[PDB]
Design a protein around this ligand. Sequence first.
Ligand SMILES: Cn1nc(C(C)(C)C)cc1NC(=O)Nc1ccc(Cl)cc1
Ligand SMILES: CCCCCCCCO[C@@H]1O[C@H](CO)[C@@H](O)[C@H](O)[C@H]1O
Length: 332
Amino acid sequence: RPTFYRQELNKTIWEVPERYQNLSPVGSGSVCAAFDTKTGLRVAVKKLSRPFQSIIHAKRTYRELRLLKHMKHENVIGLLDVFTPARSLEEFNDVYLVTHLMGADLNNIVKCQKLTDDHVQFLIYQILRGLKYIHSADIIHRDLKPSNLAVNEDCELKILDAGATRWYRAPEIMLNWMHYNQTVDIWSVGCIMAELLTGRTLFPGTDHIDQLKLILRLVGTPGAELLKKISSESARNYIQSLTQMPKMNFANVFIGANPLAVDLLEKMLVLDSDKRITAAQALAHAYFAQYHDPDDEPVADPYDQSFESRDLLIDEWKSLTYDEVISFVPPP
Ligand SMILES: Cn1nc(C(C)(C)C)cc1NC(=O)Nc1ccc(Cl)cc1
Ligand SMILES: CCCCCCCCO[C@@H]1O[C@H](CO)[C@@H](O)[C@H](O)[C@H]1O
């Protein structure tokens, strides 16, 4: 145990190792920017909010620590440190996570700077590279969106999950298909890419039903091959009565754009999730010829997520989370 110190920021009490100095809030879990003295770099410190209040909250805390500890990739958020002031399992009630401070997210970059095709290839390439890694650990993001993409002054990017919200969501998630293959994240990428190319939100729906309406206007109402696969009689009938929107020609939609960018978008923005390009396939697409290195697109170690099936007591999840804090080994 290093030495800790108390400070109040925005009516929140923060107890951190003296290692971390100059704390100033960035967001509300609550996040502070800090100076890491041992390494002399700026970091973000997140104080977990009510981590062990319910069984579901306690499992989320554990899930969050388990995940961040596992993520070891350039284009994915990584855990620099995890600490608790607690001297013992009985004293355990707060969790803090430490990661790189990246100065800005992808909205910010898009909403005032017009991006070149080269900017788009590089930024999307990095999202796909990080996604290949995420997906190889049998993890699905489910909420990919520009605010979950941190970007530095070299436009190097990492994927995170900080916790408008639905403009990037796969149509199957908004019909609560409740199965979801990993290509839901690829839908999200198509939406992000289109917006980097045009500077405009692809599907800026006002509410849930407007969202879907806008999606179908571009990609059309489901074709016969898709409808064939819908096991739910009600879902089928919901779908089949809506006016039968034709699939738009993307070349006629994304006018100024690289024909290779258009081809890739067509392969990502498919209603049928069985037919969407995977992260690994997308990396070898010609759009990214300048960036693609098949020997530098690493996959993750096996990730044991059997805890996901488990129904445990708050204090069990708490103890399990406490073990993970203790076993943490900081990066090189
Ligand atoms: C839950 N989750 N899932 C992922 C992915 C899927 C991107 C690996 C990442 C995370 N969690 C986070 O990204 N958590 C997090 C913690 C501290 C800060 Cl300052 C910012 C974010
Ligand atoms: C309004 C009509 C929207 C239909 C879009 C949903 C089609 C998504 O695609 C479906 O996703 C499932 C994964 O969850 C798979 O099991 C199916 O095989 C696949 O076709």
